[PDB]
Coordinates of C-alpha atoms in Angstrom, one line a residue:
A1 CA 41.3 51.8 -31.6
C2 CA 41.9 49.8 -28.3
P3 CA 41.9 46.0 -28.5
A4 CA 40.8 43.7 -25.6
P5 CA 43.8 43.4 -23.2
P6 CA 45.0 39.8 -22.6
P7 CA 44.2 38.2 -19.4
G8 CA 46.5 39.0 -16.4
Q9 CA 47.6 35.7 -14.7
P10 CA 48.4 36.1 -11.0
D11 CA 51.2 33.4 -11.0
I12 CA 54.5 33.4 -13.0
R13 CA 56.2 30.0 -13.6
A14 CA 59.5 30.9 -15.4
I15 CA 62.5 28.6 -15.9
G16 CA 66.3 29.2 -15.6
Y17 CA 68.2 27.9 -18.6
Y18 CA 72.0 28.1 -17.5
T19 CA 73.7 24.7 -16.8
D20 CA 76.9 26.0 -15.2
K21 CA 78.0 27.6 -11.8
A22 CA 78.9 30.8 -13.8
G23 CA 75.5 31.0 -15.6
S24 CA 77.1 31.4 -19.1
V25 CA 76.0 28.1 -20.8
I26 CA 72.4 28.0 -22.1
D27 CA 70.5 24.6 -22.1
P28 CA 68.4 25.1 -25.3
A29 CA 65.5 22.8 -24.0
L30 CA 65.1 24.9 -20.7
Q31 CA 65.6 28.2 -22.7
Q32 CA 62.6 27.1 -25.0
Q33 CA 60.5 26.1 -21.9
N34 CA 61.1 29.6 -20.3
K35 CA 60.4 31.4 -23.6
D36 CA 57.0 29.5 -24.0
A37 CA 56.0 30.0 -20.3
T38 CA 56.9 33.8 -20.4
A39 CA 55.5 34.5 -24.0
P40 CA 52.2 36.1 -22.9
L41 CA 54.0 38.3 -20.2
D42 CA 56.6 39.4 -22.9
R43 CA 53.7 40.2 -25.3
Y44 CA 52.0 42.3 -22.7
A45 CA 55.2 44.3 -22.0
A46 CA 56.0 44.7 -25.8
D47 CA 52.4 46.0 -26.3
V48 CA 52.3 48.4 -23.4
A49 CA 55.9 49.7 -24.2
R50 CA 54.7 50.3 -27.9
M51 CA 51.3 52.0 -27.1
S52 CA 53.1 54.2 -24.6
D53 CA 55.8 54.8 -27.4
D54 CA 53.0 55.9 -29.8
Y55 CA 51.7 58.4 -27.2
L56 CA 55.3 59.9 -26.7
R57 CA 55.6 60.2 -30.6
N58 CA 52.6 62.3 -31.5
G59 CA 50.7 63.0 -28.2
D60 CA 47.6 61.1 -29.4
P61 CA 45.4 60.6 -26.3
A62 CA 43.9 57.4 -27.8
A63 CA 47.5 55.8 -27.4
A64 CA 47.8 56.8 -23.7
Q65 CA 44.1 55.8 -22.9
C66 CA 44.7 52.4 -24.5
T67 CA 47.9 51.9 -22.5
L68 CA 46.0 53.0 -19.3
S69 CA 43.1 50.6 -20.1
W70 CA 45.6 47.7 -20.5
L71 CA 47.4 48.6 -17.2
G72 CA 44.1 49.1 -15.4
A73 CA 43.0 45.6 -16.4
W74 CA 46.1 43.9 -14.9
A75 CA 45.7 46.2 -11.8
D76 CA 42.0 45.0 -11.5
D77 CA 43.2 41.4 -12.2
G78 CA 46.0 41.6 -9.5
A79 CA 48.3 40.3 -12.3
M80 CA 51.7 39.0 -11.0
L81 CA 50.6 39.4 -7.3
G82 CA 50.2 35.6 -7.0
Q83 CA 52.9 32.9 -6.5
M84 CA 56.4 33.4 -8.1
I85 CA 56.9 29.6 -8.8
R86 CA 60.5 28.3 -8.4
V87 CA 61.2 25.5 -11.0
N88 CA 65.0 25.2 -10.8
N89 CA 65.9 28.9 -9.7
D90 CA 64.4 32.4 -9.0
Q91 CA 63.6 33.1 -12.8
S92 CA 60.0 33.9 -11.8
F93 CA 61.2 36.6 -9.4
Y94 CA 63.5 38.2 -12.2
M95 CA 60.6 38.1 -14.7
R96 CA 58.3 40.1 -12.3
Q97 CA 61.1 42.8 -11.9
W98 CA 61.4 43.0 -15.8
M99 CA 57.6 43.1 -16.0
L100 CA 57.3 45.9 -13.3
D101 CA 60.1 47.7 -15.2
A102 CA 58.0 47.5 -18.4
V103 CA 54.6 48.3 -16.9
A104 CA 55.9 51.1 -14.5
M105 CA 57.8 52.9 -17.3
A106 CA 54.8 52.6 -19.8
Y107 CA 52.6 54.1 -17.0
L108 CA 55.1 57.0 -16.3
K109 CA 55.2 57.7 -20.1
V110 CA 51.3 58.1 -20.2
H111 CA 50.8 59.3 -16.5
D112 CA 49.8 62.9 -17.6
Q113 CA 46.7 61.5 -19.3
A114 CA 45.7 59.3 -16.3
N115 CA 42.4 60.4 -14.6
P116 CA 41.9 60.0 -10.8
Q117 CA 40.1 56.6 -11.1
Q118 CA 43.0 55.3 -13.3
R119 CA 45.7 56.6 -10.9
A120 CA 43.6 55.1 -8.0
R121 CA 43.4 51.7 -9.8
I122 CA 47.0 51.5 -11.2
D123 CA 49.1 53.0 -8.3
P124 CA 48.2 50.5 -5.5
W125 CA 49.0 47.6 -8.0
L126 CA 52.4 49.0 -9.1
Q127 CA 53.1 49.8 -5.4
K128 CA 52.3 46.2 -4.3
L129 CA 54.5 44.8 -7.2
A130 CA 57.4 47.1 -6.1
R131 CA 57.0 46.2 -2.3
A132 CA 57.0 42.5 -3.2
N133 CA 60.2 42.8 -5.4
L134 CA 61.8 44.7 -2.4
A135 CA 60.7 41.8 0.0
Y136 CA 62.8 39.4 -2.3
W137 CA 66.1 41.5 -1.4
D138 CA 65.4 41.8 2.4
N139 CA 67.2 38.4 2.4
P140 CA 71.0 39.0 2.7
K141 CA 71.9 35.6 1.2
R142 CA 70.7 36.9 -2.3
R143 CA 73.8 38.4 -4.0
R144 CA 73.0 41.9 -5.3
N145 CA 74.1 41.7 -8.9
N146 CA 72.5 43.2 -12.0
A147 CA 69.1 41.6 -10.9
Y148 CA 69.1 44.2 -8.0
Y149 CA 69.7 47.0 -10.6
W150 CA 66.7 45.7 -12.7
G151 CA 64.7 45.5 -9.4
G152 CA 65.6 49.1 -8.6
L153 CA 64.5 50.4 -12.0
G154 CA 60.9 49.2 -11.6
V155 CA 60.8 50.2 -7.9
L156 CA 62.0 53.7 -8.8
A157 CA 59.7 54.2 -11.9
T158 CA 56.8 53.1 -9.5
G159 CA 58.0 55.7 -6.9
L160 CA 58.1 58.5 -9.4
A161 CA 54.8 57.7 -11.4
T162 CA 52.7 57.1 -8.2
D163 CA 54.6 59.8 -6.1
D164 CA 55.6 57.3 -3.2
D165 CA 58.7 58.8 -1.6
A166 CA 59.7 55.5 0.2
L167 CA 59.7 53.4 -3.0
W168 CA 61.7 56.3 -4.8
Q169 CA 64.4 56.1 -2.0
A170 CA 64.5 52.3 -2.2
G171 CA 65.0 52.7 -6.0
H172 CA 67.9 55.1 -5.4
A173 CA 69.6 52.7 -3.0
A174 CA 69.5 49.9 -5.6
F175 CA 71.2 52.4 -8.1
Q176 CA 73.7 53.4 -5.3
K177 CA 74.7 49.7 -4.7
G178 CA 75.5 49.4 -8.5
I179 CA 77.7 52.6 -8.6
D180 CA 79.4 51.6 -5.3
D181 CA 80.4 48.1 -6.9
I182 CA 82.0 49.8 -9.9
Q183 CA 85.9 49.1 -9.6
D184 CA 88.5 51.6 -10.9
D185 CA 88.7 49.1 -13.8
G186 CA 85.1 50.0 -14.7
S187 CA 84.2 46.3 -14.0
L188 CA 81.6 44.8 -11.6
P189 CA 83.0 41.7 -9.7
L190 CA 79.7 39.8 -9.7
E191 CA 79.4 40.4 -13.5
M192 CA 83.1 39.3 -14.1
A193 CA 82.1 35.9 -12.7
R194 CA 79.7 35.2 -15.6
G195 CA 82.3 33.5 -17.9
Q196 CA 81.8 34.1 -21.7
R197 CA 78.7 36.4 -20.8
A198 CA 80.8 38.8 -18.6
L199 CA 80.8 41.6 -21.3
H200 CA 77.0 40.8 -21.9
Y201 CA 76.4 41.1 -18.2
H202 CA 78.4 44.4 -17.9
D203 CA 76.1 45.9 -20.6
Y204 CA 73.0 44.3 -19.0
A205 CA 74.0 45.8 -15.5
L206 CA 74.9 49.3 -16.9
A207 CA 71.5 49.6 -18.8
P208 CA 69.1 49.8 -15.7
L209 CA 71.7 52.1 -13.9
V210 CA 71.5 54.5 -16.9
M211 CA 67.6 54.3 -17.0
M212 CA 67.5 54.9 -13.2
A213 CA 69.9 57.9 -13.7
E214 CA 67.4 59.2 -16.4
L215 CA 64.5 59.0 -13.8
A216 CA 66.5 61.0 -11.2
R217 CA 67.1 63.5 -14.0
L218 CA 63.3 64.0 -14.5
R219 CA 63.4 65.3 -10.8
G220 CA 66.4 67.5 -11.5
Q221 CA 68.7 65.2 -9.6
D222 CA 72.2 64.2 -11.1
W223 CA 73.0 60.7 -10.0
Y224 CA 75.5 60.2 -12.9
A225 CA 77.9 62.5 -10.8
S226 CA 78.0 59.8 -8.0
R227 CA 81.5 58.7 -6.9
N228 CA 83.1 61.1 -9.6
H229 CA 80.9 59.8 -12.5
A230 CA 82.0 56.1 -11.6
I231 CA 79.3 55.1 -14.1
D232 CA 81.5 56.6 -16.8
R233 CA 84.2 54.0 -16.2
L234 CA 81.6 51.2 -16.6
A235 CA 80.1 52.9 -19.8
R236 CA 83.7 53.1 -21.2
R237 CA 84.6 49.5 -20.2
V238 CA 81.5 48.1 -22.0
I239 CA 81.7 50.1 -25.3
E240 CA 85.5 49.3 -25.5
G241 CA 84.5 45.7 -25.0
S242 CA 82.0 45.9 -27.9
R243 CA 84.9 46.9 -30.4
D244 CA 87.5 44.6 -28.7
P245 CA 87.0 41.9 -25.9
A246 CA 90.8 41.4 -25.1
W247 CA 90.4 43.1 -21.7
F248 CA 87.4 40.9 -20.5
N249 CA 89.1 37.8 -22.3
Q250 CA 92.4 38.5 -20.3
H251 CA 90.5 39.5 -17.0
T252 CA 87.8 36.7 -17.1
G253 CA 90.1 34.2 -18.8
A254 CA 87.1 33.2 -21.1
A255 CA 86.5 34.2 -24.8
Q256 CA 83.6 36.6 -24.8
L257 CA 80.5 36.1 -26.9
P258 CA 80.5 39.3 -29.0
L259 CA 78.3 42.2 -27.7
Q260 CA 76.5 45.0 -29.4
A261 CA 75.8 47.7 -26.7
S262 CA 72.1 48.0 -25.9
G263 CA 70.0 51.3 -26.0
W264 CA 71.5 52.9 -22.9
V265 CA 73.9 54.6 -25.5
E266 CA 71.0 56.8 -26.7
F267 CA 70.8 58.6 -23.3
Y268 CA 74.5 58.3 -22.1
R269 CA 75.8 59.7 -25.5
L270 CA 74.0 63.0 -24.6
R271 CA 75.2 63.2 -21.0
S272 CA 79.0 62.3 -21.4
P273 CA 79.9 61.9 -25.2
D274 CA 83.5 60.7 -24.2
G275 CA 85.0 61.6 -27.6
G276 CA 82.1 60.2 -29.7
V277 CA 83.0 56.5 -28.6
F278 CA 79.1 55.8 -28.3
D279 CA 78.2 57.0 -31.9
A280 CA 79.1 53.7 -33.7
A281 CA 76.4 51.9 -31.4
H282 CA 74.0 54.9 -31.9
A283 CA 74.3 54.4 -35.7
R284 CA 72.7 50.9 -35.3
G285 CA 69.4 52.3 -33.9
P286 CA 66.6 52.8 -33.3
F287 CA 66.7 50.8 -29.9
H288 CA 63.5 49.1 -28.6
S289 CA 63.5 47.4 -25.1
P290 CA 60.2 47.1 -23.3
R291 CA 62.0 46.3 -20.0
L292 CA 63.9 49.7 -20.3
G293 CA 60.7 51.5 -21.0
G294 CA 60.4 50.9 -24.8
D295 CA 61.8 53.1 -27.6
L296 CA 65.1 54.4 -26.0
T297 CA 66.0 56.3 -29.1
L298 CA 62.7 58.2 -29.0
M299 CA 62.8 58.8 -25.2
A300 CA 66.4 60.0 -25.3
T301 CA 65.8 62.5 -28.2
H302 CA 62.3 63.9 -27.1
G303 CA 62.0 62.8 -23.4
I304 CA 60.7 59.8 -21.3
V305 CA 57.7 62.1 -20.4
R306 CA 55.9 64.7 -22.7
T307 CA 55.3 67.3 -19.9
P308 CA 57.7 67.4 -16.7

């Protein structure tokens, strides 16, 4: 059944790979360096997403218990509670938010199988990771773009899974900053500044906002309603952009790398079907994203959590 977890390194040394002020032009050499430096961390997230996927699929306690064993090792190791090393930007910080997103969701998914010793071992670790990612945004010179929405998702999943009301509320605030920034356009000013990756970054911003709204929904809260379903304008801007990038081309003045919408469609489809405009993207599934919690198709259809 359960293979030996990989080691849990305390430091992250990730590398930024955009050459230009707009962060739209990839230096292939730096991109390869960042891929190689983050491979073990990505493998851990992919694995913990998948083993928690398996437990959601057929309620097999072996799947959950292996997930819990893997999380408990990195908890015991104090994985990613060391130094976030800056090479040429904050890539190490972003990577810890994506990692917390992956590990916190996996934990939530298998939480109902967690015994008191497992809870007691994992919760403190997730709470420390969440509090450290929050420390990163106590600085007002750090512009709250999609990175803050990715930060929020892990903080929030942590708040829900470990029942910490303060982290839950900090998560909500991150969500609320995103919804507040949505123009009547459906655009996000800080994402419109990312040249040929504006459409990519509208998709990439919307995705953690949708997953955060799905976590609120597990507590019977409707955050999608906020500012008259402002999120719907962004959902509709992105999916239009995937069939035809004229609007973003005109409004960024920059030819848009084509986009296929990511697995936020699988949830949002069910909440606001908006004439079926999300079904073409739905057809291309299933959608796997460890940093969104894993198999989004599976979670939207049967639930993020097996028992409320």
